[PDB]
Design a protein around this ligand. Structure first.
Ligand SMILES: Nc1ncnc2c1ncn2[C@@H]1O[C@H](COP(=O)(O)OP(=O)(O)CP(=O)(O)O)[C@@H](O)[C@H]1O
Ligand SMILES: Nc1ncnc2c1ncn2[C@@H]1O[C@H](COP(=O)(O)OP(=O)(O)CP(=O)(O)O)[C@@H](O)[C@H]1O
Ligand code: NA
Ligand code: NA
Lengths: 375, 375
């Protein structure tokens, strides 16, 4: 019986849970109000504030941090790496604290687990960071030398549902081909070729179909124009990619249930914009089908939007069932996903990756690719 | 946004959770040691003890019981009723407190929700009690007039996975035919005919295949003999049906992972007994296939034992795939299951049943059946 602690720091919340083997024994979401949050200049300044909530969470359990077998955290903005469960080390910490790859609340998670680790000797891990990158070189070329397509998406949910589909039919994730569509506030559509995400859109940076809250890919010219059109507000213009865009920008809401209600009342602009979102998701799924050369076992719809079975799901299904049957796996459980990955490691069913080495192996391969600087 | 509280009292534990719509915000399992538990004569005496833990659980949340939209509890030993979400009323309470249908820790749940209800005005519900009974008359005949086959199983998990399978393929639970096998410490195999469990074994009372901890159906003669063979210990002989039987009685453990480890070491008695359990599950699935006249869309393996994909799952699959394809849906989430059922009701997507009336409609039909007393 292994007792595990999962750490999941988000932009506006902090989720923690305790697992005893595969059974969850405690979980609590600690939301943070804009007020309470704006009290910090840089994101790193929240470090002690959030650690305090975690120590407190275990504290009022009667258990001590040394009674745990592992501490597991959501990855963060680490350098590109293959999927898997990594041991938190010195290089990871240095990178996270220096925000060399950007600052994000999720970076605090690994740091927090590491300290819990230095005080108890218990192992700390991070699994499937948002920077998981397992794509093929051909997918990196963008059309212009000083631009690269990068793999930045909800890799944890992707990998997790893919393995769930396999396990459901007692097959191996490694022997299938899938098109998995994670449709939440962010939308990533990935091509899984034999356990490897060979191509996917850069969801986190706003590339792809538009979402309930993001605008997704936008017209090039019209952009470079409205770019320096005086309307320049590096911030304002920058929030139209991850904050103020998509359904919320057209209908004034990012709640699908609200939008479906309107469609049932005869709202035509609402239905036209919602239908356009499904239309885009379908197109991208088509892109990924072409990536797999048509060899697709299943198309999987997952994420919050997969719950909407009256319009969205049926619309997508009609357009893409010619590629492969459609399977719906609604939602996503980050806590359970992280704890199980740590259990597999503790049970010796999976080998822990070493971020340090693993990062070098990746950069070495990427650097050989990047050697296109030869004129 | 509806805030819901789920109440789940078990034999040795108490699980509570708080949902804000479909998002879980707090959950905690309160295990109770034999010492702390044996401090009460009758099960009803734990009433105030467990209520105190629930009030405390919400207490340290900052929220007040009146800020909730609903209180949801696991059913209990109520009189037979169709599946669904019931409003807790006076008749239910009277029945639970009087243990007329038996005493069980799960009975405390509804009672606790009801009080929370009388203090705040908020609605209290119980969903899919273990006594859900939707079988056909033909399935009730046992072979002897003063004996009836009763439907007592983990109806919540059954109903829940069945609907999940449907939703997965965007079809309606009401338009399919399934054989669902819940394989945990208790094993129920049910025939789902168009959204109605028309037949299933009385898992809770020890009828069916043997389990990791229960003996299941036993030889009649050998039983009636060993019945009054002096070895009579109404208790001891009674615990060989739900406590001391099955794998634990043969191998000395009810942990499948432990048993699989032994099989990998060459243990032959272990492998022979484990294989016999799969063998039995398969036979019962065959019984249910005959109940559906072969019209089966899918065979679904769910519950803890569904996690064991090295032996159990593959053994069952080989024996029954001639009936219909096999789908594996491991585990079971009671908290999420209860909260979602209350959300659907609060959202008006499902109508709440009235235990009082619903119980009469059931007994009336049963009584017409029972009218076989006409010589
Ligand atoms: N039952 C339901 N019916 C219809 N829509 C639902 C739903 N539950 C959630 N949604 C919608 O699906 C969308 C996504 O929820 P999800 O939990 O995946 O998003 P997120 O807020 O966590 C952001 P991201 O996906 O980038 O992490 C929501 O924005 C909501 O509009
Ligand atoms: N990952 C895993 N691999 C193999 N076996 C597992 C497992 N997780 C659980 N099990 C086994 O499956 C069985 C059932 O767990 P489940 O959670 O359904 O049981 P339960 O204890 O809740 C009793 P009941 O099913 O009657 O409520 C356990 O008895 C255990 O031996
Ligand atoms: Na777009
Ligand atoms: Na038996």
């Amino acid at each position: 019986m292994f007792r595990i602690l999962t750490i999941n720091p988000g932009s506006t919340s902090t989720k923690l849970s305790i697992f005893e083997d595969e059974r969850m024994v405690k979980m609590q979401n600690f939301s943070h109000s804009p007020d309470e949050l704006g009290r910090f200049q840089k994101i790193l300044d929240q470090l002690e504030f959030r650690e305090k909530i975690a120590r407190q969470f275990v504290e009022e359990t009667g258990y001590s941090l040394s009674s745990f077998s592992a501490f597991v955290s959501r990855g963060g903005l680490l350098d590109p790496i293959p999927g898997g469960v990594y041991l938190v080390d010195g290089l990871m910490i240095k990178t996270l604290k220096s925000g060399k790859n950007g600052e994000h609340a999720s970076n605090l998670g690994a740091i927090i687990a590491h300290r819990f680790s230095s005080e108890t000797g218990v192992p700390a891990y991070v699994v499937d960071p948002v920077v998981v990158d397992e794509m093929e070189d051909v997918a990196r070329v963008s059309g212009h030398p000083n631009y690269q397509r990068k793999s930045i998406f909800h890799a944890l949910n992707q990998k997790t549902v893919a393995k769930e589909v396999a396990r459901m039919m007692n097959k191996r994730y490694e022997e299938m081909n899938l098109v998995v569509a994670h449709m939440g506030g962010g939308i990533s559509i990935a091509a899984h070729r034999k356990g490897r995400v060979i191509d996917v859109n850069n969801a986190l940076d706003g590339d792809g179909p538009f979402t309930p809250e993001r605008s997704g890919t936008l017209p090039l010219t019209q952009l470079v124009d409205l770019c320096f059109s005086g309307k320049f507000t590096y911030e304002e213009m920058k929030k139209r990619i991850v904050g103020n865009g998509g359904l919320v920008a057209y209908l004034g809401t990012s709640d699908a249930r609200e939008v479906v209600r309107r469609i049932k009342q005869g709202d035509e602009w609402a239905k036209r914009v919602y239908r356009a979102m499904a239309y885009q998701i379908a197109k991208w799924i088509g892109k990924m089908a072409a990536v797999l050369k048509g060899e697709v076992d299943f198309i999987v719809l997952t994420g919050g939007l997969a719950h909407e079975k009256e319009f969205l799901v049926p619309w997508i299904t009609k357009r893409v069932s010619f590629i492969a049957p459609v399977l719906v796996f609604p939602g996503s459980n980050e806590e359970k996903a992280l704890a199980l990955s740590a259990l597999r490691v503790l049970r010796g069913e999976e080998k822990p990756k070493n971020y340090s080495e693993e990062s070098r192996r990746w950069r070495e391969r990427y650097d050989s690719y990047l050697d296109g600087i030869l004129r």
